[PDB]
């Protein structure tokens, strides 16, 4: 009760102090000019009294609320001094004041701008933000020295409100909102001075940048601590919404700009700022990741100093093998990706074995540069000596296929698949040329799709070999659809090349290499090739998900490719045309037809 | 000190003659390279052409070499000598 | 010449071999020891007689031995007692080669110039001429004594010269039985000089006074028993014949002649300090034929030696085995063939042929033919001199085989450190001599037994420095013989010709491939910082270094694997699996060696990385590069050498 009555007397004094900080009755206003300086010095002297008298006198959050109310009037007083300097600039200030004028008249009427600073002139930050937003077309429009010579004064004016926080012995939502909306425009400052850089002249503006970097550092490293305090205190994330949108987007964008500013800095200034402001550990480290040198003098001392840097451990994931084992890969980190071949760590390492298994299973999704994993899948197989047979098959098939495919492709030995013409439904030709040109066949994920492209019969022949060797991966439906598309291409070429001479080499190559004994290769048939039961939108979206073309076009292309044969097979001639052939080839050879399940025996 | 003074050797032609006198101051032969063989008893290679000079009591009985050939070119030593050269040119 | 006494002896032996008339092996022994004692007395210092006295006595013994070997052998079937003839052989060397004082100087004109009327110095001048005549007669100087007796008015000594000349006419016949008993009684009469008193007893066969023998030397001392046996054996046979009659006899004579050993028991007892010298006691062993009984008896008292004795006893056996086949003891023969070749160390360079004349069994068997494999090192003079002496075929196949198999047991300690380093300087300094015996045996037919000696030393290399690479350079010093072994191999018949010609041809390809990789790896390491700033020549040379290596690896992998898999001779496959497994990792680091020196030019980074990264990737289709890691242990080494490319290529 007594503290509330004293707080009421102080609030009445604060209102009279706000009027006294902007205008005072005792002094003669007419005498001289706007005594903003004296109006401020009065409240400044009174602040020492308020502090000495309210020694301790803290109750709940009343002392913190009073300390926060102090900054509502102490900070504004330092603006008119800039006005004085701006009154030395005059033409800029008058154009500014007048602009501010229109602002108020459009924003809150009240006879445009009158420099009475009624109600503590809170709209001063809004006018500042509007002017900063208009400087991107007015001054960006004006030279770096001009805008460069201009922004320095605003920097020095803003940089005078932190020396009072260390003088009040600083240990609510209003405290979080006292200086937060200005972050919506502060980021428009550094760039405006840094984009000009040395105004395209370094040998003379190195000093001009060294004398100004202080303001940028003091703004960033101090304004940054308010966010996490406000966020932990307010817990707005829940509502989140426009406050969080502004806040979080500004935070990411400021992390990007504070790191480049940290890079473009004088020696150890960022290093001191990294130690002084415990924030942006990543940007600090980016400046600190041996940007200057690899000298064991300063670096070991800075390095050792991190101490509690769990965050630094995430530093090693930038681009080695130091830090006294560093608890292996930062306790083996999480998902290694490529760092997994590095996680060999001079050991057999079961993870390193799963790591190349993880390299194939990570070729599954959005992979690149397989030649590492390709040589490293072979290398991990060597390191090792169920999953072993699968890995050996994957290695052999994928490697030989990617090699032969890139060779024949870049080689262009087989000129073209003749039938396709002017069809959007298949840009796989260009996709595959791009793949073959770089990145170890761009990791070569769509090994399935590759074989589909057929330009010479010799290049097309191999597919069923991989299908009967390592086809333990896809579903039976996928494997059968592949084989059916292959047989359909064969039929479309063999009806045209008079005699159907394409099958007469493949029926022999499949039996002279002994593929049926080590591979239960399913026998193709008229029903097996004209089998549309494996045509579903889910399988379509899974197989052809890379190309962002409408699935209807691919469905129409596939239906045409199936119906051409479904119509050409009059009286089902193809049936005989295969049965007689395969059975005449596999006659003297240890092979018999297994009409129970359409397979080959011995 | 059997000062065996030998003299009379020399160089003759094929078919000439020589007279080797040996005075014992108090006959074997050695060719260039071979071993010392006995000449004078008479060697089979000089029987009928040479006459030895060995005498009973105090009798030198000095005698010569008639019909000399190139197979008799050697150094002759005395025994009961320093050597005396007897060469025969072909 | 003079210094090389052994060499002179060898030359005489060589001449005899060429001729192969047999009595010329010992006659040459008289020309060696003579010129030696003459080279120290014709001109030079006088103190050399301390060594010339040894040569002045070794030459008279070879003269006495030449008459004993020709009498008991050369018995020609020309137109009785065979043991009495030895006394004549002893008198020839005891009379011709004896010491004789020259004629006395300042002989007086008239007689008794100083004149019981003669002074004390007159009987001395009479005894001086008495000793000068008493010595010449003992040496067979009749021709000289007959003139000497007439010259000095010394007619008192001429009465016996014809009595000897009458005794010489009776010896050539082979009465006077009473004349032998008068001089012996004249030796018991008083009034005679000491030199004349010994002359009367020496001609008959009696013993004079001991005061005249004190002066007599222990060497000469032997004529006392020689003349007594002659005076008794003729009186015995003379007595047997009795060609004088009993009346003609006066006094009994000791007609009991003793043997040689009873006489030698007294000559070495009167003057033993010189009568038992090592160069004069050899004449009794020629009558006994015991060769190794005088030299093998000086090898037991080692607590307390003469080179002239070993050269004569050994040279005797080569003649003793020849004079009578097997006359020298078979044990003594091989003991003389072994003691000669061992003692002939300072002179073993020229006598590498004289030891073959008495081959016997030490040469037909691997006994005296294995010592030449211990000196034949670098000089090419001794290797060509052994090509004579009519020795080849199996002996050449037994000296070359004993040269490579005798050093294989010494390298047994070179196969123990299978996981550590060792001292290989001796192997890098003694095996170099282990390849000159086969390189000198230029025989296209004896090439299979030596072509495998280098491949038998690939496992002694082990880790660190290899000895086969240095051995590959020894074969390059004598190549071309491969053309001589491939043409001569089609001369002799062979059954297993499908596997013996394939192993020699494959070993030459792998070795030449190995010698090429060693020289390719020596030129890139010696590059270091070559060409200086003008790396344009290096930009093409390093490009050639990186191509010649990426090709050499794929080629060396196909040569070792060309041995197929299953073969009967799998012993040759288990030995070459390690050498193939040891030439793998050294190649990937050389491309990485362009990231320490050629790293100043960011050009070997993107090249040498992928070039070595896929070197293990394609090493997984040819049976996972076999398992060169299973035969050497180098698995994680490949895992780290390539893993380092993740902090440099990005």
Contact residues for B87 (Cβ-Cβ < 8 A; gap 6+): B10, B11, B12, B73
- What SS3 state is found at B65? strand
Contact status, residue B20 vs residue B27, Cβ threshold 8 Å:
yes
Beta-strand pair B84-89/B10-13: parallel
- What SS3 state is found at A66? helix
For residues A579 and A589, what is the distance between their CA atoms, to the nearest angstrom? 16
Phi, psi of A533 (to 5 degrees): -70, -15
* DSSP output for C401-413: HHHHSTTTTGGGG
CA atoms within 13 A on the CB side of C253: 29
For the domain C122-259, what is the CATH code?
1.10.3450.20
Kindly list the distances between the CA atom of residue C105 and the CA atoms of A58, A593, C145, in Å, as whole numbers in the listed order. 159, 140, 17
For residues C32 and C9, what is the distance between their CA atoms, to the nearest angstrom? 7
CA atoms within 13 A on the CB side of A119: 5
| Nearest-by-Cβ selection for C146 from B33, B58, B79 | B58
Contact status, residue A366 vs residue C619, Cβ threshold 8 Å:
no
CA atoms within 13 A on the CB side of C261: 4
Give the experimental resolution in Å. 6.4
Phi-psi region of C101 (alpha: psi -120 to 50; beta: other; left: phi over 0): beta
Kindly list the distances between the CA atom of residue A434 and the CA atoms of A439, A444, B39, in Å, as whole numbers in the listed order. 10, 11, 115
CB < 8 Å from C in window 4-23 of B:
none
Q: Nearest 5°: CA angle at B34, between B29 and B37? A: 35
Chain interruptions in chain A, by residue before each (C–N > 2.5 Å): 171, 319, 385
Q: Does A182 touch chain C (CB under 8 A)?
A: no
Query: Which residues in C have their CB inside 8 Å of a CB on B?
Result: 12, 15, 24, 27-28, 30-31, 96, 99-102, 136, 139-144, 146-147, 165, 168
Q: Which of C95, C12, C286 is nearest to B36 (CA)?
A: C12
For residues A593 and A523, what is the distance between their CA atoms, to the nearest angstrom? 9
Angle between the N-to-C axes of helices A350-363 and A370-384, in degrees from 0 to 180, rounded to the nearest 10 = 140
Partners of A383 on chain C (C-beta within 8 Å) are 635, 639
- What SS3 state is found at C181? coil
Contact A375 C629 (CB under 8 A): no
Helices (H), A323-386: 327-330, 339-342, 350-363, 370-384
For residues A233 and B41, what is the distance between their CA atoms, to the nearest angstrom? 151
Residue to substitute from C15, C27, C104, interface B, most B β-carbons within 10 A: C27
Q: Which of B83, B81, B75, B88 is nearest to B30 (CA)?
A: B75
Residue to substitute from C620, C629, C635, C644, interface A, most A β-carbons within 10 A: C620
Contact status, residue A93 vs residue A86, Cβ threshold 8 Å:
yes
How distant is the Cα of C639 from the closest Cα of chain A, in angstroms? 7
Strands of the sheet containing B18-25, edge to edge, are B3-7, B18-25, B63-65
Contact status, residue C72 vs residue C108, Cβ threshold 8 Å:
no
For residues C628 and C632, what is the distance between their CA atoms, to the nearest angstrom? 6
Partners of A290 on chain C (C-beta within 8 Å) are none
Phi, psi of A304 (to 5 degrees): -55, -35
Tokens 């004249």, located at residue? C186
Kindly state the DSSP code that residue A522 receives in the 8-state scheme.
P
- What SS3 state is found at B50? strand
Integer distance in angstroms from the first to the last C-alpha of chain C?
82
Q: Nearest 5°: CA angle at C290, between C288 and C291? A: 135
Q: Which of C7, C528, A378, C137 is nearest to C146 (CA)?
A: C137
Query: What's the token pair of residue C73?
Result: 């052998």
Contact status, residue C318 vs residue C357, Cβ threshold 8 Å:
yes
| Boundaries of every domain in chain A | 386-600
Using only C-alpha atoms, chain C has a radius of gyration, in whole angstroms, of: 42
Helices (H), A364-475: 370-384, 387-411, 428-437, 439-442, 447-452, 457-461, 463-470
Contact status, residue A378 vs residue C616, Cβ threshold 8 Å:
yes
How distant is the Cα of C164 from the closest Cα of chain B, in angstroms? 10
Q: What residue in C sits closest to B80 (Cα-Cα)?
A: C96
Contact residues for C254 (Cβ-Cβ < 8 A; gap 6+): C228, C232
Using CB atoms, which chains have 3+ pairs under 8 A with C? A, B
For residues C37 and C279, what is the distance between their CA atoms, to the nearest angstrom? 15
Query: What's the token pair of residue C633?
Result: 């242990």
Using only C-alpha atoms, chain A has a radius of gyration, in whole angstroms, of: 38
Phi-psi region of C190 (alpha: psi -120 to 50; beta: other; left: phi over 0): beta
Contact status, residue A581 vs residue A504, Cβ threshold 8 Å:
yes
- What SS3 state is found at C84? coil
Integer distance in angstroms from the first to the last C-alpha of chain A?
104
Contact status, residue C238 vs residue C177, Cβ threshold 8 Å:
yes
Helices (H), C242-355: 260-270, 272-275, 282-285, 307-323, 330-343
Q: Nearest 5°: CA angle at A454, between A448 and A457? A: 120
Q: Nearest 5°: CA angle at B52, between B48 and B56? A: 135
Contact residues for C427 (Cβ-Cβ < 8 A; gap 6+): C411, C414, C460, C467
Contact status, residue C504 vs residue C448, Cβ threshold 8 Å:
yes
| Boundaries of every domain in chain B | 3-89
Give the number of other Cβ atoms within 10 Å of residue C16's Cβ: 18
Contact residues for C618 (Cβ-Cβ < 8 A; gap 6+): none
Contact status, residue A184 vs residue A254, Cβ threshold 8 Å:
no
Contact status, residue C132 vs residue C103, Cβ threshold 8 Å:
yes
Contact C100 B35 (CB under 8 A): no
Partners of C639 on chain A (C-beta within 8 Å) are 344, 346, 379, 383
For residues C469 and C588, what is the distance between their CA atoms, to the nearest angstrom? 19
Give the number of other Cβ atoms within 10 Å of residue C87's Cβ: 14
Give the number of other Cβ atoms within 10 Å of residue C491's Cβ: 8
Contact residues for C26 (Cβ-Cβ < 8 A; gap 6+): C62, C65, C66, C69, C319
Partners of C613 on chain A (C-beta within 8 Å) are 371-372, 375
For residues C64 and C94, what is the distance between their CA atoms, to the nearest angstrom? 9
- Which class does domain B3-89 fall in? mainly beta
Phi, psi of C165 (to 5 degrees): -65, -30
Contact C165 B57 (CB under 8 A): yes
Helices (H), C40-103: 49-71, 85-95
Tokens 């006595």, located at residue? C57
Give the number of other Cβ atoms within 10 Å of residue C206's Cβ: 19
Q: Give buried/exposed letters for C611-623 (b at 16+ CB in 10 A, else e).
A: bbbebbbebbeee
Helix (H) or strand (E) holding C477: none
Residue to substitute from C9, C100, C143, C166, interface B, most B β-carbons within 10 A: C143
Phi, psi of A20 (to 5 degrees): -75, -25
How distant is the Cα of A286 from the closest Cα of chain C, in angstroms? 17
């Amino acid at each position: 009760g007594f503290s509330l009555d004293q707080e009421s007397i102080e609030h009445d004094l604060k209102l009279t102090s706000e009027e006294i900080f902007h205008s005072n009755g005792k002094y003669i206003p007419p005498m001289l000019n706007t005594l903003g300086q004296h109006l401020s010095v009065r409240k400044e002297f009174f602040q020492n009294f308020l502090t000495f008298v309210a020694k301790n006198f803290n109750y709940k959050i009343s002392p913190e609320l009073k300390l926060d109310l102090i900054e509502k009037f102490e900070i504004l007083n330092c603006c008119i001094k800039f006005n004085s300097i701006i009154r030395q600039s005059d033409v800029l200030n008058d154009i500014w004041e007048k602009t501010l004028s229109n602002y108020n008249l459009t924003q809150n009427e009240h006879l445009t701008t009158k420099t009475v600073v009624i109600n503590s002139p809170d709209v001063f930050p809004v006018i500042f933000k509007q002017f900063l937003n208009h400087v991107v077309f007015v001054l960006f429009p004006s030279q770096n020295q001009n805008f460069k010579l201009n922004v320095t004064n605003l920097i020095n004016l803003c940089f005078y409100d932190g020396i009072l926080e260390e003088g009040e012995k600083t240990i609510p939502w209003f405290i979080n909102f006292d200086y937060l909306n200005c972050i919506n425009q502060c980021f428009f400052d550094f760039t405006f001075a840094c984009e000009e850089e040395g105004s395209l002249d370094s040998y003379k503006e190195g000093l001009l940048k060294i004398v100004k970097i202080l303001y940028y550092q003091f703004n960033q490293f101090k304004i940054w601590i308010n966010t996490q305090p406000v966020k932990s205190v307010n817990a707005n994330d829940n509502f989140i919404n426009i406050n969080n949108l502004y806040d979080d987007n500004h935070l990411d964008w400021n992390h990007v700009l504070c790191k480049v500013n940290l890079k473009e800095q004088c020696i150890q200034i960022a290093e001191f700022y990294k130690d002084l402001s415990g924030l942006v550990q990543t940007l600090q480290t980016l400046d600190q990741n041996d940007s200057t040198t690899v000298s064991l003098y300063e670096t070991f001392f800075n390095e050792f100093p991190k101490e509690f840097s769990f965050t630094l451990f995430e530093y090693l994931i930038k681009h080695q093998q130091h830090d006294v084992l560093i608890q292996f890969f930062q306790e083996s980190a999480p998902k290694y990706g490529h760092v997994a071949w590095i996680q060999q760590i001079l050991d057999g390492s079961y993870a390193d074995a799963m790591n190349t298994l993880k390299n194939i299973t990570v070729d599954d999704s959005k992979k690149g540069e397989s030649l590492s994993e390709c040589e490293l899948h072979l290398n991990v197989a060597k390191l090792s000596s169920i999953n072993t047979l699968r890995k050996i098959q994957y290695n052999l098939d994928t490697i030989d296929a990617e090699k032969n495919i890139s060779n024949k492709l870049k080689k262009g030995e087989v000129q073209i698949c003749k039938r396709f013409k002017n069809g959007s439904i298949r840009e796989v030709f260009n996709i595959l040329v791009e793949e073959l040109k770089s990145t170890t066949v761009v990791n070569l994920s769509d090994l399935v799709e590759l074989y589909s492209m057929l330009d010479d019969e010799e290049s097309l022949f191999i597919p069923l070999r991989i299908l009967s060797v390592d086809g333990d991966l896809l579903n039976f439906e996928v494997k059968k659809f592949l084989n059916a598309l292959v047989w359909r291409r064969i039929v479309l070429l063999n009806a045209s090349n008079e005699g159907d001479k394409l099958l007469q080499h493949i029926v022999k190559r499949v039996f002279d290499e002994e593929l049926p004994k080590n591979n239960d290769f399913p026998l193709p048939s008229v029903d097996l090739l004209c089998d549309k039961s494996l045509l579903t939108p889910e399988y379509i979206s899974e197989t052809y998900g890379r190309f962002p073309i409408d699935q209807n076009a691919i469905r129409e292309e596939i239906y045409e490719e199936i119906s051409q044969v479904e119509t050409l097979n009059s009286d089902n001639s193809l049936e005989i045309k295969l049965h007689s052939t395969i059975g005449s080839v596999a006659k003297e050879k240890n092979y018999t037809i297994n009409y129970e399940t359409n397979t080959v025996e011995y | 000190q059997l000062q065996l003074v030998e003299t009379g050797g020399g160089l003759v032609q094929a078919g000439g003659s020589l007279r080797l006198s040996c005075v014992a101051s108090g006959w074997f032969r050695q060719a260039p390279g071979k071993e010392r063989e006995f000449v004078a008893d008479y060697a089979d290679s000089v029987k009928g052409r040479f006459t030895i000079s060995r005498n009973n009591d105090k009798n030198t009985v000095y005698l010569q070499m008639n019909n000399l050939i190139p197979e008799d070119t050697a150094v002759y030593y005395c025994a009961a000598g320093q050597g005396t050269q007897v060469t025969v040119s072909s | 010449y003079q210094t090389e006494r052994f060499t002179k002896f060898s030359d005489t032996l060589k001449e005899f071999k060429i001729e192969q008339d047999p009595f010329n092996i010992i006659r040459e022994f008289r020309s060696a020891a003579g010129q030696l004692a003459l080279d120290l007395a014709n001109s030079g210092d006088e103190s050399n007689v301390i060594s010339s006295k040894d040569w002045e006595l070794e030459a008279r013994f070879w003269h006495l031995v030449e008459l004993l070997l020709v009498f008991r052998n050369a018995d020609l079937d020309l137109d009785d007692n065979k043991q009495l003839y030895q006394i004549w052989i002893v008198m020839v060397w005891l009379k011709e080669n004896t010491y004789v004082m020259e004629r006395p100087k300042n002989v007086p004109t008239s007689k008794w110039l100083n004149s019981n009327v003669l002074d004390v110095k007159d009987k001395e001048e009479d005894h001086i001429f008495f000793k000068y005549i008493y010595e010449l007669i003992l040496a067979g100087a009749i021709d000289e004594a007959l003139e000497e007796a007439k010259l000095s008015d010394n007619i008192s000594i001429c009465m016996i010269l014809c009595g000897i000349q009458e005794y010489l006419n009776p010896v050539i016949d082979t009465k006077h039985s009473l004349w032998r008993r008068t001089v012996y009684s004249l030796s018991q009469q008083a009034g005679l000089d000491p030199y004349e008193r010994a002359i009367y007893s020496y001609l008959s066969g009696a013993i004079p006074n001991q005061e005249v023998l004190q002066y007599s030397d222990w060497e000469s001392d032997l004529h006392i028993h020689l003349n007594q046996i002659l005076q008794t054996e003729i009186e015995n046979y003379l007595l047997e014949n009795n060609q004088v009659g009993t009346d003609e006899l006066i006094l009994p004579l000791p007609s009991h002649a003793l043997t040689v050993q009873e006489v030698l028991n007294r000559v070495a007892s009167r003057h033993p300090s010189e009568s038992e010298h090592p160069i004069r006691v050899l004449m009794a062993s020629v009558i006994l034929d015991s060769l190794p009984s005088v030299i093998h008896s000086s090898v037991e008292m080692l607590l307390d030696d003469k080179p002239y004795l070993l050269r004569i006893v050994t040279h005797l056996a080569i003649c003793l085995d020849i004079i009578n086949p097997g006359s020298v003891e078979e044990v003594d023969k091989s003991k003389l063939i072994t003691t000669y070749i061992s003692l002939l160390k300072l002179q073993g360079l020229y006598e590498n042929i004289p030891i073959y004349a008495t081959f016997l069994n030490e040469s037909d068997c691997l006994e005296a033919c294995s010592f030449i494999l211990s000196s034949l090192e670098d000089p090419q003079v001794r290797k060509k001199q052994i090509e004579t002496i009519n020795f080849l075929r199996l002996p050449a196949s037994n000296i070359l085989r004993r040269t490579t198999q005798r050093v294989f047991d010494e390298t047994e300690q070179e196969y123990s450190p299978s996981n550590e380093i060792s001292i290989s300087f001796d192997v890098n300094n003694i095996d170099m001599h282990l390849i000159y015996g086969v390189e000198w045996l230029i025989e296209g037919k004896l090439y299979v037994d030596a072509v495998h000696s280098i491949i038998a030393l690939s496992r002694r290399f082990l880790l660190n420095g290899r000895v086969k690479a240095l051995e590959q350079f020894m074969e390059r010093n004598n190549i071309g013989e491969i053309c001589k072994n491939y043409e001569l191999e089609k001369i002799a018949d062979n059954i297993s010709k499908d596997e013996n010609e394939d192993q020699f041809l494959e070993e030459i390809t792998q070795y030449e491939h190995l010698i090429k990789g060693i020289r390719e790896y020596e030129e890139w390491q010696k590059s270091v910082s070559l060409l200086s700033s003008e790396s344009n020549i290096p930009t093409l040379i390093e490009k050639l270094q990186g191509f010649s290596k990426d090709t050499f690896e794929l080629i060396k992998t196909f040569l070792v694997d060309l041995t197929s898999s299953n073969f009967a001779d799998s012993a040759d496959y288990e030995i070459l699996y390690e050498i193939r497994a040891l030439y793998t990792p050294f190649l990937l680091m050389e491309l990485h060696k362009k990231l320490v020196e050629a790293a100043k030019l960011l050009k070997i980074p993107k090249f040498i990385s992928e070039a070595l990264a896929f070197t293990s990737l394609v090493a997984n289709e040819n049976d996972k590069i076999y398992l060169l890691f299973q035969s050497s242990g180098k698995l994680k080494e490949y895992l780290d050498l390539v893993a380092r490319t993740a902090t440099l290529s990005n």
